[PDB]
């Protein structure tokens, strides 16, 4: 543990990067029995403005939803040692910015891989906070969910027809939901 390669693989916890239109955040996320568990408490995710800030936080004794995990002692100890290397792999980069402007322009202005990752993070966040806001908004009977399902399936012909104001409104609601689930440090 520490500077060991595959450190994050072995501790089973992913550092993740989250880019909003105004900040880039760092936090930790894992899956315990297919439920997501973030670095945080009371369905609220602790976010840090740099990799060094996250490392500093992981050195101090705290009580949060990851602390009782078996490999978390490996994380804190490596944070005390100064061996902890916070690295985010490419599939753990979530970009939420710009989607609101791309939705308005219709599905063909929305990047598929970006949206795929952003939906993953959204559903993880609604899972961990035990809130159905994301799950309901993405039902395929609703404007956003229909637009999202179309963009994520290149084999789809039933194209949403303009304008897209309803999808934009539902997406703005989700952004506000996301902002309220983030605790800054
Ligand atoms: Br639509
Ligand atoms: Br609506
Ligand atoms: Br946000």
Author numbering: 236 to 420
Please share text taken word for word from the publication where this structure appeared.
Here, we demonstrated that SatS, which we revealed is required for M. tuberculosis growth in macrophages, functions in the export of SapM and an additional subset of the proteins exported by the SecA2 pathway. We further identified properties of SatS that indicate a function as a protein export chaperone that protects its substrates from inappropriate interactions in the cytoplasm and additionally assists in their export. SatS is a highly acidic (pI 3.83), cytoplasmic protein with a role promoting export of a subset of the proteins exported by the SecA2 pathway. Finally, we determined the structure of the C-domain of SatS (SatSC), which reveals a new fold lacking similarities to any solved chaperone structures, yet contains surface hydrophobic grooves resembling those of the SecB chaperone.
To gain further insight into SatS function, we collected diffraction quality crystals and determined the crystal structure of SatS to 2.3 Å. Upon inspection, the electron density map only corresponded to the last 185 amino acids (L237-E420) C-domain of the SatS sequence (SatSC). The molecular weight of the SatSC crystal was ~25 kDa as determined by SDS-PAGE, indicating that the protein underwent in situ proteolysis in the crystallization buffer. Although we set out to solve the structure of SatS in its entirety, we were only able to obtain structural information for the C-terminal half of the protein (SatSC), which arose during crystallization. Further investigation revealed striking similarity between the experimentally derived SatSC secondary structure and the predicted secondary structure of the first ~180 amino acids of the N-domain of SatS (SatSN). The SatSC and SatSN domains are also similar in size with 41% sequence similarity at the amino acid level. This raised the possibility that SatS is comprised of two similar domains with an intervening ~60 amino acids that is predicted to be a flexible, disordered linker. However, the primary sequence and secondary structure similarity between the N-terminal and C-terminal halves of SatS raise the possibility of SatS being comprised of tandem SatSC-like domains. SatSC displays α/β secondary structure comprised of a mostly parallel, four stranded β-sheet core, flanked by seven α-helices. Investigation of the SatSC structure revealed a large network of negatively charged amino acids surrounding two surface exposed hydrophobic grooves, which are similar in arrangement, shape and size to the hydrophobic client binding sites of a SecB monomer.
